[PDB]
């Protein structure tokens, strides 16, 4: 019905061996700037596809 | 559909306005009756001068139902107002001296095949 023995610190690691939702994997290159961005996403500084859009 | 507790009219004479359907029988898991399927029936109001009496249990066949009959070609021939014919269990054939409604010829099993040999235009 309930826990009668505590799971091991090996079992803890067996349940954290796939824990990364993001690795994070390699970036993509721009087209008018020496800058790089996330695959199919505009940077927080506005860089994407040589357009430099909605920058701050 | 014609199932348990169904209250319906008789197609033979002397049976009166009401008889009750009390299980289909003839095999495992038998529910609902189609045209020419034999059902078990009980008599409740039958005319005193007729061959049958109240509370005596008989065999009957469905002659009218809105599921109709489609065996000949796949097109459904349908009937308004659920009705049954009363069958002899030992000597075979229907038990009345008259029959009501226009009727059908698809009732072709030899134990009731005499139905086409009566006063109707079928």
């Amino acid at each position: 019905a309930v826990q009668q023995n505590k799971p091991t610190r090996s079992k803890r690691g067996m349940r954290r061996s796939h824990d990364a939702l993001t690795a994070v994997t390699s970036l993509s290159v721009d087209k008018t700037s020496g800058e790089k961005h996330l695959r199919h996403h505009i940077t927080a500084d506005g860089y994407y596809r040589g357009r430099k859009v909605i920058a701050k | 559909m014609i199932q348990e507790q169904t209250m319906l009219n008789v197609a033979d004479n002397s049976g009166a306005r009401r008889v009750m359907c009390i299980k289909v029988l003839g095999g495992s898991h038998r529910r609902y009756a189609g045209v020419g399927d034999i059902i078990k029936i009980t008599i409740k109001e039958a005319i005193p001068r007729g061959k049958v009496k109240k509370g005596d249990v008989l065999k009957a066949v469905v002659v009218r139902t809105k599921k109709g009959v489609r065996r000949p070609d796949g097109s459904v021939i349908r009937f308004d107002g659920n009705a049954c014919v009363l069958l002899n269990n030992n000597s075979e054939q229907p038990i009345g001296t008259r029959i009501f409604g226009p009727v059908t010829r698809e009732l072709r099993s030899e134990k009731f095949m005499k139905i086409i040999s009566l006063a109707p235009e079928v």
Binding site: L38, H40, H41, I42, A44, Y48, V53, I54 | -
Partner: protein, 120 residues
């Protein structure tokens, strides 16, 4: 599964979604740019582009539109003279979607949705 359903279910009741998209599509004509979420913005093209294409046909019997579907009370005085004559001729594609990733420290897929202001 979902049998034949091809439109996505997003967030809130279908009644709240109806009014939120009605309010966002009419207001984007005056704001020119809106900041919102990617799944929401990907379904905005389905209601804001036909609202601009509504000015493509010219008739005295076309001015009573945008009153039963996608109501807005202020575009109905300017849109037929402004975007109807040359822009609405292209019958779609007026929108740009800007995928921006995270908004802050939370999990929401942030997007900006804007209208094209010059065709050439």
């Amino acid at each position: 599964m979902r049998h034949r359903k091809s439109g996505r279910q997003l967030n809130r009741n279908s009644s709240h979604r109806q009014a939120m998209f009605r309010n966002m599509a009419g207001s984007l004509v005056r704001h020119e740019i809106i900041k919102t979420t990617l799944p929401k913005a990907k379904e905005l093209r389905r209601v804001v582009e036909p609202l601009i294409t509504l000015a493509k046909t010219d008739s005295v019997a076309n001015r009573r539109l945008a009153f039963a579907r996608t109501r807005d009370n202020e575009i109905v005085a300017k849109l037929f003279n402004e975007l109807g004559p040359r822009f609405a001729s292209r019958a779609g594609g007026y929108t740009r979607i800007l995928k921006c990733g995270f908004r802050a420290g939370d999990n929401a897929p942030m997007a900006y949705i804007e209208l094209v202001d010059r065709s050439e």
